[PDB]
């Protein structure tokens with residue numbers, strides 16, 4: 526049949542199993558922001574199991590990883606709003622732990638479905654291209670001195686106006702997640718996200734801020750390292766295009 530349907534049925538079954546864990550009801554449905562009146566002042570990406578299930582049914586998750594990322598938001602949001610050691614956060618973690626047990630149990634079947642949905646996940650040129658990009662991010666860009674502001678998404682709890690100014694945020698962890706999902710098939714698409722980190726620093730911090738000078742160095746070492754690997758990256762991009770057309 527349709528591998529997206531089979532995949533969605535597996536993911537829904539995992540939701541059924543997490544819904545059955547003790548004390549999980551506060552996560553079954555969206556937070557009521559008219560009761561929890563400051564919730565959206567603190568949380569940027571609300572998530573709950575009902576929304577997760579409805580998204581599975583809308584065929585929004587072509588792989589384990591897109592599903593797990595949304596599930597992990599449930600934990601992160603609780604850690605931010607309720608606290609990292611709050612019983613609610615521990616409860617949300619028990620659901621993520623069960624999901625990970627189930628994904629491990631079914632990893633070979635899930636891998637087959639993911640490849641049938643998106644053959645590029647099995648293409649050795651896509652995999653090699655993504656591996657190189659990840660190494661540029663971890664070994665060069667994240668090694669820039671004082672680059673910590675750009676390693677992770679800004680937490681709105683700590684910087685409350687950040688996302689009112691920056692409506693298209695980007696950070697190196699999000700880029701790594703994109704790489705793991707093989708989002709980038711060329712250097713151009715990778716550089717769209719890298720440059721967004723710098724543009725956001727110019728907008729939020731100013732062009733002459735030390736934050737922006739650091740972001741500029743991150744971008745500069747990215748260009749420098751991509752240039753060093755130009756001939757290999759060009760071959761991979763050509764072969765990825767050929768794989769993409771053949772599908």
Ligand SMILES: C[C@@H]1COCCN1c1cc(C2([S@](C)(=N)=O)CC2)nc(-c2cccc3ccccc23)n1
Pocket residue numbers: 673674675676677678679680681683684687726729730736
């Ligand atoms: C907004 C700022 C400039 O523009 C680039 C992004 N910047 C960030 C980013 C982060 C993150 S975080 C920890 N996940 O929010 C991602 C690591 N933290 C902080 C920050 C947090 C809490 C207190 C701070 C006090 C002084 C200076 C910065 C503070 N600023």
